[PDB]
A paper describes a structure:
They interfere with protein synthesis by targeting the region of [name] (rRNA) helix h44 forming the decoding center within the 30S subunit of the ribosome (inset 1). Binding of 2-DOS-containing aminoglycosides to the decoding center displaces two universally conserved nucleotides, A1492 and A1493, promoting their interaction with the minor groove of the codon-anticodon duplex in the aminoacyl (A) site of the ribosome.
The crystal structures of the [name] 70S ribosome in complex with [name], [name], AMK or KAN were determined at ~2.9 Å resolution by molecular replacement using a high-resolution model of the 70S ribosome with the tRNA and [name] ligands removed (see “Methods”). The initial difference Fourier density maps calculated using the Fobs – Fcalc amplitudes revealed, as expected, clear unbiased density for AMK or KAN in the canonical aminoglycoside binding site in helix h44 of 16S rRNA (inset 1). The AHB group of AMK forms three additional hydrogen bonds with nucleotides C1496, G1497, and m3U1498 in h44. One secondary binding site for AMK is in the vicinity of the [name] acceptor stem 3’CCA-end and the P-loop of 23S rRNA. The AHB moiety and ring II form a surface that is chemically complementary with that of the universally conserved nucleotides G2252 and G2253 of the P-loop. The hydroxymethyl in ring III and the amine in ring II are within hydrogen-bonding distance of the non-bridging oxygen atoms of [name] A73 and C2254 of the P-loop, respectively, and the amine of the AHB group forms multiple H-bonding interactions with G2252 of the P-loop. The difference Fourier map of the [name] 70S-AMK complex revealed one AMK molecule bound between the 30S and 50S subunits at the center of bridge B5. The AHB hydroxyl group and the chemical moieties decorating ring III form multiple interactions with ribosomal protein uL14 residues Tyr7, Glu45, Glu54, and the main chain carbonyl oxygen of Lys44.
Author numbering:
A (entry chain 17): 1 to 48
B (entry chain 1D): 2 to 276
Write the structure that this text describes.
Amino acid sequence: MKRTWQPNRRKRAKTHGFRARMRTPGGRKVLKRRRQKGRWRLTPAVRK
Amino acid sequence: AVKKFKPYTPSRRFMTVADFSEITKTEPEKSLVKPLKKTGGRNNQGRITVRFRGGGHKRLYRIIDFKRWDKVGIPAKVAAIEYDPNRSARIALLHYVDGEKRYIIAPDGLQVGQQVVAGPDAPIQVGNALPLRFIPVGTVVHAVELEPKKGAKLARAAGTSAQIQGREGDYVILRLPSGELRKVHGECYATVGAVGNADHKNIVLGKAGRSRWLGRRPHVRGAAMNPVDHPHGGGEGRAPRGRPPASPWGWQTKGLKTRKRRKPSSRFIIARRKK
RNA sequence: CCGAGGGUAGGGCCCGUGACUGGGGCGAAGUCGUAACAAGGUAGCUGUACCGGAAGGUGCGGCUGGAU
RNA sequence: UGGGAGAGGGUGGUGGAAUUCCCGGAGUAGCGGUGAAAUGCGCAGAUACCGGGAGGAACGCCGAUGGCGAAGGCAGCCACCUGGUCCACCCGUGACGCUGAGGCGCGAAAGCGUGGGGAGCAAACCGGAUUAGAUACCCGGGUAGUCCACGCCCUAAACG
RNA sequence: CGAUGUCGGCUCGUCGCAUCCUGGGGCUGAAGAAGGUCCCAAGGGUUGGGCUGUUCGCCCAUUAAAGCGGCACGCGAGCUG
RNA sequence: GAAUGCCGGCAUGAGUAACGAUAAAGAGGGUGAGAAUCCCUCUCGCCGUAAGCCCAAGGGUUCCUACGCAAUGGUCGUCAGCGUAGGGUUAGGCGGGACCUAAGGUGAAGCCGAAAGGCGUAGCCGAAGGGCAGCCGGUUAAUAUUCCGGCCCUUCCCGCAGGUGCGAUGGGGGGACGCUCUAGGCUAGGGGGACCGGAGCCAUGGACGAGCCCGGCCAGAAGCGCAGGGUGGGAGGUAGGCAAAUCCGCCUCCCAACAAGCUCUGCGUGGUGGGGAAGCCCGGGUGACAACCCCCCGAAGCCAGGGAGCCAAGAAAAGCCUCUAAGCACAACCUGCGGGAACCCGUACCGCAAACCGACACAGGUGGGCGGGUGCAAGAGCACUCAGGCGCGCGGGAGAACCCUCGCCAAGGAACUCUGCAAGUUGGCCCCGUAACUUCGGGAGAAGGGGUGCUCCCUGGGGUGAUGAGCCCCGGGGAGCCGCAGUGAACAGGCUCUGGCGACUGUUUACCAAAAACACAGCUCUCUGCGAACUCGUAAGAGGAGGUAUAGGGAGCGACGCUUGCCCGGUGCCGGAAGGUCAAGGGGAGGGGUGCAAGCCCCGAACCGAAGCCCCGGUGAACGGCGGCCGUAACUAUAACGGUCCUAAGGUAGCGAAAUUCCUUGUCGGGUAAGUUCCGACCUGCACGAAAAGCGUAACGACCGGAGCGCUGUCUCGGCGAGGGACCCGGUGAAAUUGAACUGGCCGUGAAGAUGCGGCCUACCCGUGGCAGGACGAAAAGACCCCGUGGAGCUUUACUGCAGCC
RNA sequence: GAGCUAGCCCUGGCCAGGGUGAAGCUGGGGUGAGACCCAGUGGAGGCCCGAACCGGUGGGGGAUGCAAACCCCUCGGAUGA
Ligand SMILES: NCC[C@H](O)C(=O)N[C@@H]1C[C@H](N)[C@@H](O[C@H]2O[C@H](CN)[C@@H](O)[C@H](O)[C@H]2O)[C@H](O)[C@H]1O[C@H]1O[C@H](CO)[C@@H](O)[C@H](N)[C@H]1O
Ligand SMILES: NCC[C@H](O)C(=O)N[C@@H]1C[C@H](N)[C@@H](O[C@H]2O[C@H](CN)[C@@H](O)[C@H](O)[C@H]2O)[C@H](O)[C@H]1O[C@H]1O[C@H](CO)[C@@H](O)[C@H](N)[C@H]1O
Ligand SMILES: [Mg+2]
Ligand SMILES: [Mg+2]
Ligand SMILES: [Mg+2]
Ligand SMILES: [Mg+2]
Ligand SMILES: [Mg+2]
Ligand SMILES: [Mg+2]
Ligand SMILES: [Mg+2]
Ligand SMILES: [Mg+2]
Ligand SMILES: [Mg+2]
Ligand SMILES: [Mg+2]
Ligand SMILES: [Mg+2]
Ligand SMILES: [Mg+2]
Ligand SMILES: [Mg+2]
Ligand SMILES: [Mg+2]
Ligand SMILES: [Mg+2]
Ligand SMILES: [Mg+2]
Ligand SMILES: [Mg+2]
Ligand SMILES: [Mg+2]
Ligand SMILES: [Mg+2]
Ligand SMILES: [Mg+2]
Ligand SMILES: [Mg+2]
Ligand SMILES: [Mg+2]
Ligand SMILES: [Mg+2]
Ligand SMILES: [Mg+2]
Ligand SMILES: [Mg+2]
Ligand SMILES: [Mg+2]
Ligand SMILES: [Mg+2]
Ligand SMILES: [Mg+2]
Ligand SMILES: [Mg+2]
Ligand SMILES: [Mg+2]
Ligand SMILES: [Mg+2]
Ligand SMILES: [Mg+2]
Ligand SMILES: [Mg+2]
Ligand SMILES: [Mg+2]
Ligand SMILES: [Mg+2]
Ligand SMILES: [Mg+2]
Ligand SMILES: [Mg+2]
Ligand SMILES: [Mg+2]
Ligand SMILES: [Mg+2]
Ligand SMILES: [Mg+2]
Ligand SMILES: [Mg+2]
Ligand SMILES: [Mg+2]
Ligand SMILES: [Mg+2]
Ligand SMILES: [Mg+2]
Ligand SMILES: [Mg+2]
Ligand SMILES: [Mg+2]
Ligand SMILES: [Mg+2]
Ligand SMILES: [Mg+2]
Ligand SMILES: [Mg+2]
Ligand SMILES: [Mg+2]
Ligand SMILES: [Mg+2]
Ligand SMILES: [Mg+2]
Ligand SMILES: [Mg+2]
Ligand SMILES: [Mg+2]
Ligand SMILES: [Mg+2]
Ligand SMILES: [Mg+2]
Ligand SMILES: [Mg+2]
Ligand SMILES: [Mg+2]
Ligand SMILES: [Mg+2]
Ligand SMILES: [Mg+2]
Ligand SMILES: [Mg+2]
Ligand SMILES: [Mg+2]
Ligand SMILES: [Mg+2]
Ligand SMILES: [Mg+2]
Ligand SMILES: [Mg+2]
Ligand SMILES: [Mg+2]
Ligand SMILES: [Mg+2]
Ligand SMILES: [Mg+2]
Ligand SMILES: [Mg+2]
Ligand SMILES: [Mg+2]
Ligand SMILES: [Mg+2]
Ligand SMILES: [Mg+2]
Ligand SMILES: [Mg+2]
Ligand SMILES: [Mg+2]
Ligand SMILES: [Mg+2]
Ligand SMILES: [Mg+2]
Ligand SMILES: [Mg+2]
Ligand SMILES: [Mg+2]
Ligand SMILES: [Mg+2]
Ligand SMILES: [Mg+2]
Ligand SMILES: [Mg+2]
Ligand SMILES: [Mg+2]
Ligand SMILES: [Mg+2]
Ligand SMILES: [Mg+2]
Ligand SMILES: [Mg+2]
Ligand SMILES: [Mg+2]
Ligand SMILES: [Mg+2]
Ligand SMILES: [Mg+2]
Ligand SMILES: [Mg+2]
Ligand SMILES: [Mg+2]
Ligand SMILES: [Mg+2]
Ligand SMILES: [Mg+2]
Ligand SMILES: [Mg+2]
Ligand SMILES: [Mg+2]
Ligand SMILES: [Mg+2]
Ligand SMILES: [Mg+2]
Ligand SMILES: [Mg+2]
Ligand SMILES: [Mg+2]
Ligand SMILES: [Mg+2]
Ligand SMILES: [Mg+2]
Ligand SMILES: [Mg+2]
Ligand SMILES: [Mg+2]
Ligand SMILES: [Mg+2]
Ligand SMILES: [Mg+2]
Ligand SMILES: [Mg+2]
Ligand SMILES: [Mg+2]
Ligand SMILES: [Mg+2]
Ligand SMILES: [Mg+2]
Ligand SMILES: [Mg+2]
Ligand SMILES: [Mg+2]
Ligand SMILES: [Mg+2]
Ligand SMILES: [Mg+2]
Ligand SMILES: [Mg+2]
Ligand SMILES: [Mg+2]
Ligand SMILES: [Mg+2]
Ligand SMILES: [Mg+2]
Ligand SMILES: [Mg+2]
Ligand SMILES: [Mg+2]
Ligand SMILES: [Mg+2]
Ligand SMILES: [Mg+2]
Ligand SMILES: [Mg+2]
Ligand SMILES: [Mg+2]
Ligand SMILES: [Mg+2]
Ligand SMILES: [Mg+2]
Ligand SMILES: [Mg+2]
Ligand SMILES: [Mg+2]
Ligand SMILES: [Mg+2]
Ligand SMILES: [Mg+2]
Ligand SMILES: [Mg+2]
Ligand SMILES: [Mg+2]
Ligand SMILES: [Mg+2]
Ligand SMILES: [Mg+2]
Ligand SMILES: [Mg+2]
Ligand SMILES: [Mg+2]
Ligand SMILES: [Mg+2]
Ligand SMILES: [Mg+2]
Ligand SMILES: [Mg+2]
Ligand SMILES: [Mg+2]
Ligand SMILES: [Mg+2]
Ligand SMILES: [Mg+2]
Ligand SMILES: [Mg+2]
Ligand SMILES: [Mg+2]
Ligand SMILES: [Mg+2]
Ligand SMILES: [Mg+2]
Ligand SMILES: [Mg+2]
Ligand SMILES: [Mg+2]
Ligand SMILES: [Mg+2]
Ligand SMILES: [Mg+2]
Ligand SMILES: [Mg+2]
Ligand SMILES: [Mg+2]
Ligand SMILES: [Mg+2]
Ligand SMILES: [Mg+2]
Ligand SMILES: [Mg+2]
Ligand SMILES: [Mg+2]
Ligand SMILES: [Mg+2]
Ligand SMILES: [Mg+2]
Ligand SMILES: [Mg+2]
Ligand SMILES: [Mg+2]
Ligand SMILES: [Mg+2]
Ligand SMILES: [Mg+2]
Ligand SMILES: [Mg+2]
Ligand SMILES: [Mg+2]
Ligand SMILES: [Mg+2]
Ligand SMILES: [Mg+2]
Ligand SMILES: [Mg+2]
Ligand SMILES: [Mg+2]
Ligand SMILES: [Mg+2]
Ligand SMILES: [Mg+2]
Ligand SMILES: [Mg+2]
Ligand SMILES: [Mg+2]
Ligand SMILES: [Mg+2]
Ligand SMILES: [Mg+2]
Ligand SMILES: [Mg+2]
Ligand SMILES: [Mg+2]
Ligand SMILES: [Mg+2]
Ligand SMILES: [Mg+2]
Ligand SMILES: [Mg+2]
Ligand SMILES: [Mg+2]
Ligand SMILES: [Mg+2]
Ligand SMILES: [Mg+2]
Ligand SMILES: [Mg+2]
Ligand SMILES: [Mg+2]
Ligand SMILES: [Mg+2]
Ligand SMILES: [Mg+2]
Ligand SMILES: [Mg+2]
Ligand SMILES: [Mg+2]
Ligand SMILES: [Mg+2]
Ligand SMILES: [Mg+2]
Ligand SMILES: [Mg+2]
Ligand SMILES: [Mg+2]
Ligand SMILES: [Mg+2]
Ligand SMILES: [Mg+2]
Ligand SMILES: [Mg+2]
Ligand SMILES: [Mg+2]
Ligand SMILES: [Mg+2]
Ligand SMILES: [Mg+2]
Ligand SMILES: [Mg+2]
Ligand SMILES: [Mg+2]
Ligand SMILES: [Mg+2]
Ligand SMILES: [Mg+2]
Ligand SMILES: [Mg+2]
Ligand SMILES: [Mg+2]
Ligand SMILES: [Mg+2]
Ligand SMILES: [Mg+2]
Ligand SMILES: [Mg+2]
Ligand SMILES: [Mg+2]
Ligand SMILES: [Mg+2]
Ligand SMILES: [Mg+2]
Ligand SMILES: [Mg+2]
Ligand SMILES: [Mg+2]
Ligand SMILES: [Mg+2]
Ligand SMILES: [Mg+2]
Ligand SMILES: [Mg+2]
Ligand SMILES: [Mg+2]
Ligand SMILES: [Mg+2]
Ligand SMILES: [Mg+2]
Ligand SMILES: [Mg+2]
Ligand SMILES: [Mg+2]
Ligand SMILES: [Mg+2]
Ligand SMILES: [Mg+2]
Ligand SMILES: [Mg+2]
Ligand SMILES: [Mg+2]
Ligand SMILES: [Mg+2]
Ligand SMILES: [Mg+2]
Ligand SMILES: [Mg+2]
Ligand SMILES: [Mg+2]
Ligand SMILES: [Mg+2]
Ligand SMILES: [Mg+2]
Ligand SMILES: [Mg+2]
Ligand SMILES: [Mg+2]
Ligand SMILES: [Mg+2]
Ligand SMILES: [Mg+2]
Ligand SMILES: [Mg+2]
Ligand SMILES: [Mg+2]
Ligand SMILES: [Mg+2]
Ligand SMILES: [Mg+2]
Ligand SMILES: [Mg+2]
Ligand SMILES: [Mg+2]
Ligand SMILES: [Mg+2]
Ligand SMILES: [Mg+2]
């Protein structure tokens, strides 16, 4: 049957992308907490 | 003159469609329509603020003229009578001798090809539009402005009609379609005659589907819900209301008046509505 | 081939019978009231509607086959 | 052909009296009701009186032992549409008449369907009296209905 | 109670005997035939249907008889539900 | 040494289950250390509205080639979507951008909010919608509408020629629209040919034939031809289209109207360029100068913005056209022609799947297009089959019980069982015929029955064409033939009677419930006069609604028919300017502290004083409620009748042992041999009852009852057979579980159910296939029960707050 | 966090074939004119049968599965809410 991951490059970018994060105040805290941990990627990789 | 169907399907037994006997033109005036932004009941938050709405036919809102004092003295011809899906009345297409074209809401009896006009010195004829103070006492009228220059607010549904009871200074006394007795200002315009398509109410939607086409989604009884959803929710098996019948948000719904008490319009209402 | 009739399937009319049920007729001296005949003690009758244990009552109309 | 009477029918419109309700005023201790009362209404200002407003229904006098219609039935007033009918003249057609099983149409009241309307009245129903009882007669309320449009119903002491 | 799956049916049985039948008996208000009652006896046998979830029970038609109980109201790492 | 401890390592179960659709395999020849598994050939089977082909998304080098086989591959491996290395993706016209707007998003103005932020007109963003210029063939191991070849087209820049009041982000037109049905003419596609072209073939009894077998095309500018679409022309006025306007709109007037004309598309033709089979020979080469024609079928595609009908009434904006305005008319724009110019991104491959989503090379999930042939009435159904693609990545044997799937069965035919659960029966088409009842549509495919193939003959109407032939499509009549059987295979209803609930088609607990539940048209009640009520929001602001009482909210009931009774005392709601109570505030009699005192400070009664509550009315399709005991008739029995107590009022109509009846399998009747179910009745209704609606109702139902027929392996009662497993051999190799084990029966005993204690009995050591009585077998720190001053959802006249409202 | 699921919004796409045959229109009858009837044409519908597609009724299998909801037989809807 249909499973829950239906991948989609546009969604994956307008939802979790960098610019989406920088618009919210909550989102900037995401990037801040992820830089602090030193995440290699602050954001899902999606080819576009 | 509402139209029946033979019972060749279960739904066709009771269904009745309009007769459309008074419609001349069958497509809108491309200069006077705009896109109707269907909302489905959601507000600017995206939140349903009006339940059970959505999914009806697409519609083109024909721009209707409710400030007929716009064109005082310029007669117009009644060129057509057309179907507006956005209201219960029919609408009439006016070709003004100005060359201007406008939609108004079609009064009863209005004859395609007749001419109409608006102003203080207008003839007291079906379709004309005068300030209230100049219409004879005892005249049936419609499209009544509530305040002057603010636009026609009262009596606009099929068959509605305010009757003029009398004058009292700057204010005439109207008997609204609800039976309320109100003072409206005499400078408020109004179109003499009653709104047409009175046979509107005698329509039998026939089946569930027809209600959907009107954008009306199914309506589930509070009695069918759970206590989390409704005052009437829950109960093992069936259940009377078990408390004074109430809305989904708590307030009682049998008799409980809701008009704001201190409303300033109170000063201008003579009789609360009848029946 | 047709063919008496046999069989299969489904119908129409009539007769008899049926738990129960509806009123009807009849049967010296059971119970409740008193509707009608006198203006019968609210003039009567009537079609209809609704009501009542029962006769009846009341509404709307109609007749005199109503007295004085 | 020329004349006449008429609440004959259908539509549109409209006038006044009365009742009810509503607003204003003036005013006070009862009003109403009956055989007698009670229910009811009224100092939260009723009834009685005056001005104003809304609405429905039915049309006083004329009115008659009257007129019209096939019957049921038809009554303020105005206009339109329209049926029948009678008199005059003796002009026209020349038996073209009478009745009428079926058919069809009309058909008081009540009653029914869909809208409207709703003042007075009033089945049902409530209450007050009477009474052995009183599912009545009497009194106070009162919902259909009574009115309008459309469509049914087709009954009658539809009787001379 | 860090789990002993709970009615009934089916399948498979196995035991007890306070014996339903069949075998052996005594008494009888046992003429015969057919019964009653008690004793011995568990080897074998102990039907098929209607009804109800039913166990049980009533009923149909038979029968030599249509016995009663135990085995976690025998049996769900056998089935059913 | 224990924590169902934590991390790790290694055991047990065990060479055990399994190795992922039962579409299927066999042999020969190659390569190689090694082959059932890789390569080639022949035979066999499978798919073929796909299991073939082309897009999209997503995947991201998986593509091609060479060398490799440690691991990945459920076995093997020489193979591979694996390892290493090299190659491979070419565009002005395909897609996206430098174009347009949609919802939505964002947001100069503006509004709002403690902060963060929320709104918001324009504007901007936003596509799989609008707009826009490329077709056919060849080429590479691998890209191609991209390279190449042929034939075409678009835009920008500059120049020449001709024409014209040129000029826009502003005005106007247009773009531009739904659903159903559908005409004419085409094309895609297809069938046939005794016509054209072709390597060949004569088999095994016949055939040298009008024999068999293969093929008989594709694109294409101008012009032209057929079919369509769109479109009036002139003049005068003009106050409207937020300036102007010659445009548009409105008015008048003349001419023209199924036409014609101009314009635009489609199809055909068309210079020209391509393609071109079977067969044989080693992807190629030949065939070949290949031929390339005739007839029929024919779209859902095209002409298209076609036509008709309907109600629920069917995007926007740009490109485009037209109008003018500043400006400018040395300009500028239109047309034709010429030269030049024309950027960024994608392009490999997978793409119903071994490459995407499912931890897997996972029987699951995934949108668009093409999807050939014959037959069956049709068809995308079904059976076979083309092109093409596959045999599912463990095999070989054996022919046990048992399990799955499947086939058949004597006589019986539901006797099975909770239940005909399951499986039979029926089955397409044509024809005949078809009941109660009904809302007159239905019920209805009721029921039940006949027919169905092949051959010969005779004949009727249609399409094409031409009116005929040929092709093709519907039929009619007559005579025959064969078998057990003619929808001979495959796909394709068992039917009927009678109740309960629900009107109906619909909706639902994704993953134990599809229902009688929710929804539903329809009925009633109630709120709402519009800055509406109501909803979300602190607000602004939205929805309501660009709606206006024939409208919108809330509530109940739930098509329809006939109906819906009595009670307002209590609760809710509605009404009530009086009375009673009532907080802050007003008032300040009257006291108090302090000071020499003026004063400063504190307490304070009467009285005025809102909502709410009290109080007076109203109100049931508001919440709700609708009695008890005793007596009475000339047989009995039973009470139409009465007496009394109480209530706000004492359940009306209809219904009733019911989806409700405890006693109860009530009693009686029907059905049956037999009926705790069922149907029809009665009525002392434990404990029906009228919009939490009452009683009915044709039709409808994968709902729940009962019955009859048909037919059966459900059953008496089982037997035989097929395949996939189970079994044996080779390859690979799990799991939960496990204190350790050298782990028998009985009778006892024991914490009361002992392999482990006592006594006795029995017992040589170890396996394999089997069965499930025990190991209080596994699994899950019982989900029932209690307990915890443990938690949570829900309720209310429990408490106490708060939003909101007054 | 609505790439699953629920609802709404905007923009597109899909539904083989067969069956029944409403209104209307025409013609005919009918009448004073009507209603009306008959025939033909027409092609309506939360109409019928059935693929795609959307479902998930019953039963069997599966239960350390092919699969953390699958497979087979059967079955509901399939121009509509
Ligand atoms: N004043 C009080 C009346 C009294 O009670 C009385 O007369 N009561 C009447 C008593 C008579 N015995 C009955 O008559 C019948 O019953 C008898 C049995 N006993 C029969 O034998 C007799 O052979 C028969 O005939 C009769 O039925 C009674 O009359 C009543 O019932 C009759 C039937 O409806 C009516 O007609 C009378 N109007 C009504 O009064
Ligand atoms: N009613 C009249 C009696 C008459 O004698 C008759 O034959 N009566 C009955 C006639 C019915 N039509 C039949 O009913 C059944 O069979 C029909 C086929 N024939 C089915 O269509 C029907 O759907 C089914 O329902 C039924 O079979 C007949 O029953 C007869 O046959 C039965 C078994 O043989 C017996 O048990 C009956 N007692 C006996 O009446
Ligand atoms: Mg699913
Ligand atoms: Mg996951
Ligand atoms: Mg998806
Ligand atoms: Mg922001
Ligand atoms: Mg992130
Ligand atoms: Mg119709
Ligand atoms: Mg109309
Ligand atoms: Mg019309
Ligand atoms: Mg426009
Ligand atoms: Mg918004
Ligand atoms: Mg003023
Ligand atoms: Mg509604
Ligand atoms: Mg509703
Ligand atoms: Mg509802
Ligand atoms: Mg519930
Ligand atoms: Mg919630
Ligand atoms: Mg609640
Ligand atoms: Mg409740
Ligand atoms: Mg409930
Ligand atoms: Mg209950
Ligand atoms: Mg208000
Ligand atoms: Mg004979
Ligand atoms: Mg015979
Ligand atoms: Mg028979
Ligand atoms: Mg006697
Ligand atoms: Mg009397
Ligand atoms: Mg008397
Ligand atoms: Mg009397
Ligand atoms: Mg008398
Ligand atoms: Mg009488
Ligand atoms: Mg009585
Ligand atoms: Mg009584
Ligand atoms: Mg009595
Ligand atoms: Mg009487
Ligand atoms: Mg009485
Ligand atoms: Mg009475
Ligand atoms: Mg009278
Ligand atoms: Mg005259
Ligand atoms: Mg005259
Ligand atoms: Mg006073
Ligand atoms: Mg009026
Ligand atoms: Mg007279
Ligand atoms: Mg004279
Ligand atoms: Mg004379
Ligand atoms: Mg004379
Ligand atoms: Mg003469
Ligand atoms: Mg003569
Ligand atoms: Mg003469
Ligand atoms: Mg009458
Ligand atoms: Mg009447
Ligand atoms: Mg009645
Ligand atoms: Mg009405
Ligand atoms: Mg009394
Ligand atoms: Mg007394
Ligand atoms: Mg009494
Ligand atoms: Mg008296
Ligand atoms: Mg009535
Ligand atoms: Mg009379
Ligand atoms: Mg008379
Ligand atoms: Mg326990
Ligand atoms: Mg049994
Ligand atoms: Mg058995
Ligand atoms: Mg034994
Ligand atoms: Mg004993
Ligand atoms: Mg004994
Ligand atoms: Mg003796
Ligand atoms: Mg003897
Ligand atoms: Mg003894
Ligand atoms: Mg023994
Ligand atoms: Mg016993
Ligand atoms: Mg029992
Ligand atoms: Mg018994
Ligand atoms: Mg014996
Ligand atoms: Mg026990
Ligand atoms: Mg037990
Ligand atoms: Mg079990
Ligand atoms: Mg059990
Ligand atoms: Mg079960
Ligand atoms: Mg079960
Ligand atoms: Mg159960
Ligand atoms: Mg320790
Ligand atoms: Mg563990
Ligand atoms: Mg082994
Ligand atoms: Mg083992
Ligand atoms: Mg496999
Ligand atoms: Mg496996
Ligand atoms: Mg296999
Ligand atoms: Mg296979
Ligand atoms: Mg070698
Ligand atoms: Mg293999
Ligand atoms: Mg997708
Ligand atoms: Mg991947
Ligand atoms: Mg490639
Ligand atoms: Mg390897
Ligand atoms: Mg290897
Ligand atoms: Mg190796
Ligand atoms: Mg390997
Ligand atoms: Mg540039
Ligand atoms: Mg844009
Ligand atoms: Mg914003
Ligand atoms: Mg685009
Ligand atoms: Mg392009
Ligand atoms: Mg190479
Ligand atoms: Mg090229
Ligand atoms: Mg110009
Ligand atoms: Mg439009
Ligand atoms: Mg439509
Ligand atoms: Mg072509
Ligand atoms: Mg063909
Ligand atoms: Mg030969
Ligand atoms: Mg030859
Ligand atoms: Mg203007
Ligand atoms: Mg302008
Ligand atoms: Mg302006
Ligand atoms: Mg202007
Ligand atoms: Mg101007
Ligand atoms: Mg002309
Ligand atoms: Mg032309
Ligand atoms: Mg072409
Ligand atoms: Mg050559
Ligand atoms: Mg050559
Ligand atoms: Mg040659
Ligand atoms: Mg299509
Ligand atoms: Mg077409
Ligand atoms: Mg157009
Ligand atoms: Mg200028
Ligand atoms: Mg200038
Ligand atoms: Mg110049
Ligand atoms: Mg030009
Ligand atoms: Mg050039
Ligand atoms: Mg650039
Ligand atoms: Mg880029
Ligand atoms: Mg490529
Ligand atoms: Mg591919
Ligand atoms: Mg593929
Ligand atoms: Mg696909
Ligand atoms: Mg693949
Ligand atoms: Mg995956
Ligand atoms: Mg994978
Ligand atoms: Mg595989
Ligand atoms: Mg797969
Ligand atoms: Mg799906
Ligand atoms: Mg195709
Ligand atoms: Mg064919
Ligand atoms: Mg197709
Ligand atoms: Mg091939
Ligand atoms: Mg392949
Ligand atoms: Mg296999
Ligand atoms: Mg086994
Ligand atoms: Mg058999
Ligand atoms: Mg049989
Ligand atoms: Mg049973
Ligand atoms: Mg059954
Ligand atoms: Mg079955
Ligand atoms: Mg059968
Ligand atoms: Mg019919
Ligand atoms: Mg029929
Ligand atoms: Mg039926
Ligand atoms: Mg049949
Ligand atoms: Mg039937
Ligand atoms: Mg046959
Ligand atoms: Mg054949
Ligand atoms: Mg043959
Ligand atoms: Mg022809
Ligand atoms: Mg023969
Ligand atoms: Mg067949
Ligand atoms: Mg079928
Ligand atoms: Mg039957
Ligand atoms: Mg029952
Ligand atoms: Mg239903
Ligand atoms: Mg239906
Ligand atoms: Mg579920
Ligand atoms: Mg779920
Ligand atoms: Mg269902
Ligand atoms: Mg209803
Ligand atoms: Mg709120
Ligand atoms: Mg606001
Ligand atoms: Mg709006
Ligand atoms: Mg309900
Ligand atoms: Mg009925
Ligand atoms: Mg009473
Ligand atoms: Mg009350
Ligand atoms: Mg009260
Ligand atoms: Mg206080
Ligand atoms: Mg106070
Ligand atoms: Mg107060
Ligand atoms: Mg109620
Ligand atoms: Mg009631
Ligand atoms: Mg007695
Ligand atoms: Mg006596
Ligand atoms: Mg009382
Ligand atoms: Mg009761
Ligand atoms: Mg009652
Ligand atoms: Mg009973
Ligand atoms: Mg009960
Ligand atoms: Mg019984
Ligand atoms: Mg019983
Ligand atoms: Mg039962
Ligand atoms: Mg009782
Ligand atoms: Mg009884
Ligand atoms: Mg009761
Ligand atoms: Mg109720
Ligand atoms: Mg009926
Ligand atoms: Mg029913
Ligand atoms: Mg259904
Ligand atoms: Mg169902
Ligand atoms: Mg068997
Ligand atoms: Mg057995
Ligand atoms: Mg086998
Ligand atoms: Mg073996
Ligand atoms: Mg083995
Ligand atoms: Mg041992
Ligand atoms: Mg012991
Ligand atoms: Mg022991
Ligand atoms: Mg043991
Ligand atoms: Mg073994
Ligand atoms: Mg065991
Ligand atoms: Mg354990
Ligand atoms: Mg255990
Ligand atoms: Mg525990
Ligand atoms: Mg419990
Ligand atoms: Mg405590
Ligand atoms: Mg405690
Ligand atoms: Mg606690
Ligand atoms: Mg979604
Ligand atoms: Mg997605
Ligand atoms: Mg669409
Ligand atoms: Mg398709
Ligand atoms: Mg079709
Ligand atoms: Mg047919
Ligand atoms: Mg036809
Ligand atoms: Mg159709
Ligand atoms: Mg349908
Ligand atoms: Mg299919
Ligand atoms: Mg299933
Ligand atoms: Mg599914
Ligand atoms: Mg289910
Ligand atoms: Mg199973
Ligand atoms: Mg279907
Ligand atoms: Mg729809």
